[PDB]
UniProtKB/TrEMBL annotation, chain A:
It comes from the Eukaryota. GO terms for biological process: maturation of LSU-rRNA from tricistronic rRNA transcript (SSU-rRNA, 5.8S rRNA, LSU-rRNA). Coiled coil: none annotated. One of its GO terms (molecular function) is RNA binding. PANTHER family: 60S RIBOSOMAL PROTEIN L7, LARGE RIBOSOMAL SUBUNIT PROTEIN UL30. One of its GO terms (cellular component) is cytosolic large ribosomal subunit. Residues 71-120 form the Large ribosomal subunit protein uL30-like ferredoxin-like fold domain. This is 60S ribosomal protein L7, putative. Pfam families: Ribosomal_L30, Ribosomal_L30_N.
From TrEMBL, chain B:
It comes from the Eukaryota. Belongs to the eukaryotic ribosomal protein eL32 family. Pfam families: Ribosomal_L32e. One of its GO terms (molecular function) is structural constituent of ribosome. GO terms for cellular component: cytosolic large ribosomal subunit. GO terms for biological process: translation. This is 60S ribosomal protein L32. The keyword Disulfide bond does not apply. Keywords: Ribonucleoprotein, Ribosomal protein. Residues 33-61 are annotated as: Disordered. InterPro entries: Ribosomal_eL32 (IPR001515), Ribosomal_eL32_sf (IPR036351). The keyword 4Fe-4S does not apply. CDD domains: Ribosomal_L32_L32e.
From TrEMBL, chain C:
This is 60S ribosomal protein L28, putative. Keywords: Ribonucleoprotein, Ribosomal protein. Residues 6-114 form the Ribosomal eL28/Mak16 domain. GO terms for biological process: translation. InterPro entries: Ribosomal_eL28, Ribosomal_eL28/Mak16. Pfam families: Ribosomal_L28e. One of its GO terms (molecular function) is structural constituent of ribosome. Belongs to the eukaryotic ribosomal protein eL28 family. GO terms for cellular component: ribonucleoprotein complex; ribosome. Gene3D superfamilies: 3.30.390.110.
UniProtKB/TrEMBL annotation, chain G:
This is Ribosomal protein L1a, putative. Belongs to the universal ribosomal protein uL4 family. The chain holds residues 321 to 367 of 373 of the full protein. Residues 27-47 are annotated as: Disordered. Residues 31-47 have a biased composition (Basic residues).
Length: 228, 129, 146, 96, 197, 69, 47, 144
RNA sequence: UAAGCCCAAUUAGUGGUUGCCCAUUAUUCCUUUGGUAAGGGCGGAAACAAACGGAGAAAGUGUAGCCCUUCCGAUGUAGAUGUGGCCUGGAGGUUAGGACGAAGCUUAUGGCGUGAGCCUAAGAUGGACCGGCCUCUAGUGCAGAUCUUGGUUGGCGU
RNA sequence: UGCAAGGCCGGAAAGAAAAGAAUUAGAGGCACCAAGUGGGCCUUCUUCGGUAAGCGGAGCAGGCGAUGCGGAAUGAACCGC
RNA sequence: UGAAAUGAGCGGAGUAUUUGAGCUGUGCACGGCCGCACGCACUGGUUUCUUCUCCGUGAUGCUCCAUGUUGGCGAUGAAAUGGGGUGCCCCCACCCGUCUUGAAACACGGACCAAGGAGUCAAACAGACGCGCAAGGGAGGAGAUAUGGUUGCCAGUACUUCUCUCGUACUGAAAGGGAGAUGCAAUAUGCAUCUGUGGUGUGCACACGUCAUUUGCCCAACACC
């Protein structure tokens, strides 16, 4: 009936197939990416184990190397914060109590983290935390809005890079550092977490004391998984 | 003419806002005024002082301005004003004005009962036939 | 030549037909279908318009504007009565010939007038049925004139 | 005090593990009025007509560390005239 | 509370609406607010940006400014393809200082009576914004111009007069009044005529 | 009454509230009026001859265009 | 923790969950331990 | 329109925007221009340099009439010519006479490629204004 | 046999791994309001009388917001500004009301708005004026000045 | 045809590798008009006069002033926020 | 309460490849070329254990609203929800305005009410914003008639000029002087031409390209001349 209705409702007709074809075609990649990575991870921890176990029994040792990513969360509130510890907590995107970020661990970021330590409980993430934090608390920053990740399509949208497609590419550069670690995090909205379920018992002291703040190494995972 | 139903009618706060310390003084009207007192407790929010009006008390904007009957109230001074709300009568209802008469008030009650538009202060006996 | 676009900026906030009461904006225009105050519903203002308006028993008139006799008023508004039992899509399809914008409302209003007339018929019957019992001490009749 | 959630010490329930058994049960507060008002089976079973009344609730979760269990009286709160008086914890809804 | 120093200092003022009571301007923005939205063209949403600016920010260009400018573009265009339109969202005025203007098809909100005759008498057109939507709905092959805003006597008074290296016109009704100290070098001192920054 | 107080207290908090604006770029203001003059003269004596040569190129690119087409 | 998302973000999750449930069965888990303990110790005694 | 005034938004503020500590009062600084050399010195030496002192020789009884020279530019001789005179003009041909003392101007300055050649009747002329007309095919016939 | 001091733990060499209570905090859900706000729809798709699935859809800063989905913020003295923001006496318009009862007045008279306020109900009040809306206009909003004037009042049958 | 300067015309441009080898709720920049304030006080650390002071005077910062709310029975400023 | 149930979950039909077990070959890794390899990387062998796999519905719905089951009460006087009043209980809670670093203060004003009660009017200047006109803009005072009329509505509206005034030009104490571009060219007023940005760097939109960006012109504007 409507002259342009067909010139419309036929265009909608093939844009629907374009969606469905460009959807189920993404699972194939999202599937063969995850596969590639899961096998990639067991091919590492099982390499260290064989490699560690050789340095033992011959009287050698094995360096764990140096962790690269570090999860950082802010244990104090906003009050009575000095000028240089504002400007650092802002450049780390931690603007709020119990925000969290993933950052490289290198000399400029190491020396930057120790000036704010009274504010910061940080450490070295598991793979279980990154998955949990990129899935459950993951929010992409799209056009200025903080939007939850309900889908693998929107990730491929924001990042046109096509080394980041599914949520399992997200976790990868987060976990393994790598090339796109910045442009993946920098597009994540900084994590917002609940308080720890059972608690620290003294936010005001360093962890190596009856304290929270500072570098608690891998015990951050155990501490962080209470926030999620 | 059963009204257009909305979602839940919940009000944020029913109790009114009255100005600080009007009960003590008989000339002070219960109407609100914002205290500008520098050491005034109410301005400083002391927990157990009266609460102030905010942007935060809005009425939900879905159920906003709806009387308990389900009808947004439109005033009517004469039998010709019934015709505007003939079509939307599921939404609006009429309110005869105060000064409108025992004689005009006879007319509007008829020509409302015929059209099925609803009057609030219109005689309700024709409805409870 | 004074387009509707330009005239709606003039009459929007002031009018005879505006009638904003208690924060509500209705319209007392006789040519409004549902009575909201908007361009599509301003009959006096638009260059082509239509209305679903009642007549005797259940007949449904339709008044209709048009571009051409736009000035010259007894000639710019033309009414045509549809028969008593008219379908509502019949009346709407008339209005949709002139102004397809109104195809929905004229339908809902066509069915509406049909509801009113058959509502007046039940009421005016029940009022007089029980008006017999009342003994009135006065009544008035305007005497036929030649 | 936040007057939404009551606190109930139910007799012979002395530990927390003993409270989680009661999550969901329906508490009652059986006070009385002065004049006799309307009642649930009124005029069906007129022998219930009387001055006594009840407020009902549910047990929302264990409060404390020993046998102490919070309560929600549905849509309202209990009077503060009920404090230190008899609350009734029934055995239903049964989870068994 | 979340920490956002400010947050009142990245925010800036925009004002989508118009401060003009003119009923016709309110039609022109009606057109471009529509067709700067759906048009996918740079030109067409600049004129919507510009159409809401209050008179002070829309400065009339004289004629002979359009002519000189458009004679600079007309040299390097291909001789085959010529269709520039002077499109101005301000007023266009008449320059007594220049005669013999070519035919430019200028578009504007308002023309000086002597400026419009001085166009058509030399063979050009004058076409207002309800036309140009028909001729250049994409703004294609238009030429967009602004005004000259920096010669106003208000911009001349801005800044303090007695600051070193500030040439600025002070507020006085009697010009012979303030010449005599801090201006003349002879008595107290002369404000330095130039200052490095 | 002792009115002679002096403090720096709140200042660098105010000075950074609109921030300390960084310097103006080198290219923005040169304006060499200082300046060592016999070099300044010999700079304008060239800067004139660069105008002729550059305004001539304006003409040679008028012909060469209309020459092309 | 929601079954419907996690698969949309990681379609491979089910293989991963099935591989993990392949450990938790008691028959396979200790027969896993029997072989590891023999595999490793024999490797030690080779150096 | 007193309903738009700032006073009408300030009912209830009690201080009308003049401040709680330093109050509004009457005259804080002295009345008017008072304080030029003293406690306003920064203002009058910043925004108004030159307000103080004496300058120049002294002219009693200044009557503005004997000194009257509105001038004009060669660039601006168009608007003293009606249309159809400016249409027909050429160097050596017949060209319209423009009178100044009847047109409210006196001196004829420089500043322009004279647009329309003319013979201009002017009380006062300048050097470079002379050349251009004389060169562009007009003339200057001076009057009084 | 601490309900004291030092140290330490979490239901205790029994399997590691969060005892419990309380914030205007954190996380999340609903509702409001403001954006440097982000995006979508707005060419009426078609069909369709009563009687015995309805109703809207405005090219738009602001309203009872054109509709919808989304995201972030939200406290504040002095101070600045905004409001299609409330009230008052009048003038230009427009639309109404009123001896079947106007202004005024009184009320455990309710209804609407975050609020200024509006509106209806009743008067066993009143006795002749008056409301809405656009615009104009000003002697235009009271609790405090040892404020002005009139009245009254506890102290006191002292 | 060295050096100074203004250009012009070509060259290349991990657009900044590797080495721990940056990060950002990073729109930069300019302008007009104008209010209030110009009595402050408290604290970690540094600090001068004084026997000392809930005394007087400063430095870098954070607060109260202007702001409550949860906590130290109570307290402007402490603790958490 | 299905008024678009997008579901491993709902429907349809079928029996899939992730891990763990043993091992392949080159490689890595370990020990002092061989031996090792705890089983890493590459091809990717075994099926003994382990697990479900696959494909299906756009809106022709732009918006809002409208669809269960079981009992109690509700049969025109009542029932029910909301609002209101008075008392009570548990809890929370210093007296207002003000000067003040600091007020609940043993700091000052304060018995109650009604009616009054405080940023106004005028002029000069400026900057925002609305309007007209634009190298021109605008009067002021007065005159002229419809009106030489009308109780009034009219003290208004309509009409008008040479002039006046703020502008188009500025500078010097003053006498005085007084502004374009290009080419040729160096003449103590050089000469010619007149469709034109004085030049350079940065710079909307547009135009022809390219994988945001090359070049053209660059409006406004900033800077150097």
């Amino acid at each position: 009936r409507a002259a342009f209705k067909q010139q419309q409702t036929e265009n909608f007709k093939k844009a629907v197939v374009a969606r469905k074809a460009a959807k189920a075609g993404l699972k194939k990649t999202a599937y063969l990416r995850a596969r590639k990575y899961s096998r990639e991870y067991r091919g590492a921890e099982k390499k260290l184990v064989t490699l560690r176990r050789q340095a033992a029994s011959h009287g050698n040792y094995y360096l764990e190397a140096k962790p690269k990513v570090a999860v950082v969360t802010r244990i104090r509130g906003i009050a009575k914060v000095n000028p240089k510890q504002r400007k650092i907590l802002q450049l780390l995107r931690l603007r709020q109590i119990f925000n969290t970020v993933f950052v490289k661990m290198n000399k400029p970021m190491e020396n930057m983290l120790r000036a704010v330590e009274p504010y910061i409980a940080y450490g070295y993430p598991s793979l279980a935390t990154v998955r949990a934090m990129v899935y459950k608390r993951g929010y992409l920053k799209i056009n200025g809005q903080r939007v939850k990740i309900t889908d693998n399509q929107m990730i491929k949208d924001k990042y046109n890079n096509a080394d980041i497609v599914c949520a399992e590419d997200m976790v990868n550069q987060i976990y393994t550092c790598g090339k796109h670690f910045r442009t993946v995090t920098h597009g994540m909205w900084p994590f917002k977490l609940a308080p720890p379920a059972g608690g620290m018992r003294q936010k005001r002291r360093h962890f190596v004391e009856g304290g929270d703040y500072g570098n608690r190494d891998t015990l951050i995972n155990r501490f962080l998984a209470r926030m999620i | 003419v059963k009204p257009v139903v909305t979602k839940s009618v919940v009000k944020k706060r029913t109790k009114r806002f009255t100005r600080h310390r009007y009960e003590l003084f008989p000339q002070l009207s219960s109407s609100w005024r914002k205290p500008r007192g520098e050491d005034s407790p109410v301005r400083r929010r002391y927990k157990g002082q009266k609460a102030m009006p905010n942007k935060g008390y809005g009425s939900d904007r879905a159920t906003k301005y709806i009387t308990p009957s389900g009808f947004k109230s439109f005033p009517i001074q004469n039998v010709q004003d019934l015709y505007m709300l003939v079509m939307q009568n599921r939404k609006y209802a009429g309110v005869i004005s105060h000064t409108v008469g025992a004689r005009s008030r006879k007319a509007i009650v008829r020509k409302a009962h015929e059209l099925d538009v609803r009057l609030i202060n219109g005689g309700a006996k024709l409805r409870k036939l | 030549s004074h387009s509707v676009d330009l005239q709606w900026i003039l009459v929007r906030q002031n009018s005879r037909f505006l009638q904003k009461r208690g924060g509500i904006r209705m319209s007392n225009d006789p040519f409004n279908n549902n009575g909201n105050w908007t361009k599509r519903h301003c009959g006096f203002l638009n260059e082509k318009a239509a209305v679903v308006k009642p007549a005797k028993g259940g007949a449904i008139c339709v008044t209709v504007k048009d571009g051409s006799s736009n000035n010259k008023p007894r000639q710019t508004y033309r009414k045509t009565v549809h028969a008593a039992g008219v379908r509502a899509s019949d009346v709407s399809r008339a209005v949709a010939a002139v102004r397809p914008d109104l195809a929905d409302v004229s339908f809902r209003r066509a069915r509406r007038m049909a509801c009113i007339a058959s509502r007046t018929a039940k009421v005016a019957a029940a009022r007089k049925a029980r008006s017999e019992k009342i003994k009135f001490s006065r009544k008035s009749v305007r005497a036929k004139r030649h | 005090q936040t007057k939404q959630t009551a606190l109930v010490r139910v007799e012979n329930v002395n530990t927390r593990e003993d409270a989680t058994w009661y999550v969901g049960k329906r508490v009652c507060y059986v006070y009385h009025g002065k004049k006799v008002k309307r009642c649930v089976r009124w005029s069906k079973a007129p022998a219930r007509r009387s001055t006594t009344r009840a407020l009902w609730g549910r047990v929302t979760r264990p409060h404390g560390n020993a046998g102490m269990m919070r309560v929600k009286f549905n849509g309202a709160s209990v009077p503060a005239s009920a404090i230190g008086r008899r609350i009734r914890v029934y055995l239903y809804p049964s989870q068994i | 509370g979340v920490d956002l120093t400010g947050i009142s200092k990245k925010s800036r003022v925009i004002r989508h609406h118009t401060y003009s009571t003119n009923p016709y301007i309110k039609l022109l923005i009606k057109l471009y607010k529509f067709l700067a939205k759906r048009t996918s063209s740079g030109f067409n949403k600049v004129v919507y940006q510009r159409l809401i600016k209050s008179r002070s920010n829309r400065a009339p260009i004289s004629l002979s400014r359009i002519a000189v400018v458009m004679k600079r573009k007309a040299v390097f265009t291909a001789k085959s393809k010529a269709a520039p339109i002077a499109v101005v969202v301000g007023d266009v005025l008449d320059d007594v200082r220049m005669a013999r203007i070519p035919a430019m098809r200028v578009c504007a909100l308002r023309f000086s009576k002597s400026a419009r005759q001085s166009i058509v008498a030399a063979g050009g057109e004058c076409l207002t914004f309800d036309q140009l939507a028909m001729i250049a709905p994409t703004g294609k092959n238009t030429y967009l111009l602004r005004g000259r805003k920096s010669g106003r006597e208000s911009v001349r008074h801005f800044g303090a007069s007695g600051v070193p290296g500030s040439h600025s016109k002070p507020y006085a009704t009697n010009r012979g009044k303030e010449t005599k100290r801090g201006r003349r070098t002879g008595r107290s001192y002369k404000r330095k005529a130039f200052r490095h920054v | 009454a002792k009115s002679k107080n002096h403090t720096n207290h709140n200042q660098s908090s105010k000075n950074h509230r609109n921030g300390i604006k960084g310097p103006v770029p080198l290219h923005l203001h040169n304006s060499k009026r200082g300046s060592w003059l016999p070099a300044l003269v010999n700079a304008r004596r060239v800067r004139k001859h660069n105008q002729k040569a550059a305004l001539k190129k304006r003409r040679e690119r008028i012909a060469a265009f209309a020459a092309k087409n | 923790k929601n079954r419907r998302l996690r698969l949309r973000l990681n379609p491979y999750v089910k293989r991963e969950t099935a591989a993990a449930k392949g450990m938790r069965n008691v028959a396979n888990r200790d027969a896993r331990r029997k072989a590891k303990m023999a595999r490793v110790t024999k490797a030690k005694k080779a150096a | 329109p007193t309903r738009f005034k700032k006073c009408r938004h300030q009912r209830g503020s009690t201080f009308c925007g003049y401040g709680r500590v330093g109050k509004h009062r009457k005259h804080e600084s002295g009345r008017g221009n008072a304080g030029g050399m003293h406690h306003h010195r920064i203002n009058f030496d910043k925004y108004h340099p030159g307000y103080f002192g004496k300058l120049g020789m002294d002219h009693y009884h200044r009557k503005k009439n004997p000194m009257w020279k509105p001038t004009i530019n060669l660039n601006n001789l168009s608007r003293l010519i009606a249309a159809e005179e400016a249409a027909k003009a050429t160097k050596g041909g017949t060209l319209p006479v423009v009178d100044l003392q009847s047109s409210g101007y006196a001196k004829l300055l420089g500043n322009g490629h004279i647009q329309v050649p003319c013979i201009v009747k002017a009380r006062y002329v300048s050097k470079l204004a002379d050349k251009k007309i004389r060169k562009a095919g007009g003339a200057v016939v001076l009057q009084a």
